[PDB]
Symmetry: C2
């Protein structure tokens, strides 16, 4: 029930370009000089490096982090909006969770009544409910960070708040994610976020450690990749689209090792090649986690505009995405 103050103070100590405002959950790019439109985001703690690792020049101007798996209070979101605001607009990326929407909506409304031009996009890339046939909301999950990177780059290169909103509206729909848990989140006192047999996996997972939508027997990593790819295919229908070019994220949910992640990416890259697709950009790592959960999510995004690859390849000062051309 506490903002992870020590973690945020430790981030501030580690990175000269980042400053933490004590007791607010707000971490900001202290090099940001209000010359370009700021993009901000935030959410519960426990998904690191989402979103603290995405604060920096060319990505988020600030991120607002709440307690473990609980989004930040609207007053802190509002504080962050006012701080980065200079009368050019503020863009907010929100993950599609009822709790997050409540807090961000309240802050966005208040900010607007104060004269700040705030626009937003809600990330909703998770395909679990379609893949497994549920009537629930489409969660914003690892593919959210594509908005951070693409909108952040476009903003840094001078895009207006209007242009950024239009880009977000074009990008957001293209992003599709499905993940699976290999093991639940472990809490203190030998408790876990759900029960999962050792020979079982849980497909269709989000990020706050809730059980996924479909439990299946574990039949090896290859079979797991096949399932994820099969479900993504069913939503994307890439075989019917002339554009065969995709962006891919391979996301570890916390305690899946790097060797597992790169092995799994090899598998998935081969599967997509055998689907006749070209993956034009790949990022692999713990990109958006759920404490110490073991699992993996795959995100695919059509390269709808070749420029998007330019935006993905632009250097940033954000610690979890320093990669570039």
């Amino acid at each position: 029930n506490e903002i992870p103050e020590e973690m945020l103070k430790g981030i501030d100590l580690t990175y000269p370009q980042l400053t933490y405002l004590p007791e607010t959950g707000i971490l900001y790019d202290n090099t940001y000089n209000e010359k370009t439109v700021p993009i901000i985001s935030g959410g519960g703690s426990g998904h690191e490096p989402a979103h603290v690792g995405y604060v920096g020049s060319g990505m988020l101007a600030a991120a607002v982090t709440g307690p473990l798996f609980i989004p930040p209070k609207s007053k802190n979101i509002l504080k962050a909006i006012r701080q980065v605001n200079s009368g050019k607009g503020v863009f907010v990326i929100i993950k599609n969770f009822e709790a997050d929407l409540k807090e961000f909506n309240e802050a966005i409304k208040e900010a607007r009544t104060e004269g700040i031009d705030v626009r937003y996009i809600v990330s909703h890339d998770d395909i679990s409910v379609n893949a497994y046939n549920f009537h629930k909301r489409h969660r914003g999950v690892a593919g959210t960070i594509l908005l951070h990177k693409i909108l952040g780059a476009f903003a840094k290169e001078g895009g207006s708040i209007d242009e950024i909103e239009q880009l977000a509206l074009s990008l957001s729909p293209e992003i599709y994610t499905l993940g699976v848990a290999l093991a639940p989140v472990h809490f203190p006192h030998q408790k876990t976020s759900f029960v999962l047999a050792e020979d079982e996996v849980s497909f269709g997972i989000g990020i706050h450690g809730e059980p996924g939508y479909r439990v299946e027997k574990f039949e090896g990593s290859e079979r797991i990749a096949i399932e994820l790819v099969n479900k993504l295919k069913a939503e994307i229908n890439w075989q019917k689209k002339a554009n065969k070019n995709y962006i891919l994220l391979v996301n570890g949910l916390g305690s899946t090792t790097l060797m597992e992640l790169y092995s799994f990416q090899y598998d998935v890259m081969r599967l997509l090649e055998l689907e006749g697709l070209s993956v034009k950009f790949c990022k692999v790592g713990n990109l958006m986690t759920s404490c110490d959960m073991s699992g993996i999510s795959l995100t695919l995004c059509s390269v709808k505009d070749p420029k998007w690859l330019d935006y993905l390849n632009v250097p940033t000062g954000a610690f979890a995405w320093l990669e570039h051309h």
Copy 2:
């Protein structure tokens, strides 16, 4: 729960790396991953060791850092033949520098390759990292393992080499930097393997101080009494070896390394607790790096590495940008 094979080079993991990063090329069936941007214009540095420690050392291959890394099966160093292949490939007659961690198996393979390389006329030189202070902290007559502090050698020697350093100057820098590096780690949980086996047995209320990187039990089992007391223990032991109260130069480099399954929230919170203690101790940490820097499969654990900023130039070297995926930060 699907770790690299114990009897084979992790070919899929390495090819997946190659597919991910345009600047990295994997040479199939050899374990050699190289910086494909490297032009032979500067002295190359290479390293290697078992798989299972990623991002060590595949994440440190890139412009400004390692020119190649040679990776073996899980927890088993690469065969001398593949190390020799890597040396020959990066060599252009200006020397080749090799960073080797102090483990008997690693020394055997690297020594064999270096010896054969030299008989072929290549000026290969090496440093062996031995930063683990576990045996002194806990009073054992065992080897001084090379552990997470090794990456300071990759970064500083790599930068110095990139800036034009000769093989002889690189060796001298290595001899200056290596003994400044002090590391101690603790496991909060052992490596978990298939079929419900662990790398060792650790009660839930216990931690294991003085760990290395291949999942063996630490030198000293203690009851867990909270993260702060863990930092106090590590810093107490490091202090006893470093004796910084006696040094005029209070400037340090710090690494806070997660051993695999320790979360980033835990790592940065721990970094903060440690930084506050080193502050109370009168130290100025002038560079810090936090993350999974050298792991042991899915072990939960942290190691702290301290290194005097003996030469202020070292901060410049630490801050130069590289092409290595696990160390892209710069000033």
